[PDB]
From a paper:
Here, we elucidated the molecular mechanism underlying the function and regulation of P. fluorescens LapD, a transmembrane receptor essential for biofilm formation in this strain. As c-di-GMP levels change LapD switches between two states: the dinucleotide-unbound off state that retards stable biofilm formation by facilitating the secretion of the cell surface adhesin LapA, and the c-di-GMP-bound on state that supports cell adhesion by preventing the release of LapA from the outer membrane. Binding of c-di-GMP to the LapD EAL domain is relayed to the periplasmic output domain through an inside-out signaling mechanism that utilizes a juxtamembrane HAMP domain, a relay module often found in bacterial transmembrane receptors. Here, we present three crystal structures of LapD from P. fluorescens that provide models for the c-di-GMP-unbound cytoplasmic domain lacking only the HAMP domain, a c-di-GMP-bound EAL domain dimer, and the periplasmic domain.
In order to shed light on how changes in the cytosolic domain are sensed in the periplasm, we determined the structure of the entire output domain (residues 22–151). Crystals grown with selenomethionine-derivatized protein diffracted X-rays to a maximum resolution of 1.8 Å. The structure was solved by single-wavelength anomalous dispersion phasing. The two half sites are linked via a long connecting segment that crosses over at the center of the dimer. The other striking feature is a strictly conserved loop connecting the strands β3 and β4 formed by the conserved GWxQ motif (residues 124–127 of LapD). W125 forms the most distal point of the periplasmic domain located at the center of the loop, and its side chain is in an outward-facing rotamer conformation.
Numbering used by the authors:
A (entry chain D): 23 to 150
B (entry chain F): 24 to 150
Write the structure that this text describes.
Amino acid sequence: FMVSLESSRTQYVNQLRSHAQDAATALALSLTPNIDDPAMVELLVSSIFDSGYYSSIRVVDLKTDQTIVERNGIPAVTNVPDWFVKLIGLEPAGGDALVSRGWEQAARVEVVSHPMFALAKLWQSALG
Amino acid sequence: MVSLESSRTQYVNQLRSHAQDAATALALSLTPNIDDPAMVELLVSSIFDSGYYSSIRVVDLKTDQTIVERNGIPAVTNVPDWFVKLIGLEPAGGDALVSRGWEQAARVEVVSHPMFALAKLWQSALG
């Protein structure tokens, strides 16, 4: 725990940085065939940002050096009270998929996404 | 509290599609590996560990019983601000270029929110 703190911290630092880099790389790719359609650019950026996973996303025009589109959330941690979760009562919204073995369905994969960012956003809205 | 109704359905839609995307990718990934229990477990953990999930479960349809399962941290975090300061993460950022042929047109800049990472460090600190 304390013995492994420095290495563990570095792992999370590297993980979060990779998370941000992967999103930028994916978004740049998504924007490439649409860079001259302002509406689509905004749509594609909103798509990614609306998860709540990112403190900020900005697209900068290199010729003019101006912001084309940007989005910002609060970068600090939001401590949402337990009682607000019950009050809001968010449904799990799980997803699933089948794995086949030959022609027979062999297993079902069930996934449930963590609501922490969604709850944080709902709480911020509640406070406003 | 009906004013947040539209916000709620939107976030639920996002959580659903995020989970569905992952279930579909994972099912695909498991397909060539379904008879190798160790590989199934490895692949499930790999996705679970690099994403923001409450749970991932694989059920054997022949027996209707759980094969492998991963469960996550609680819905909200009570990570104290004093612990956040002790860890003292700097912003986690990445950027990429959009080009038009050999011409560079735009730069995309992203900063990832650290709340999930900190929540995980905290749960670990609590042992």
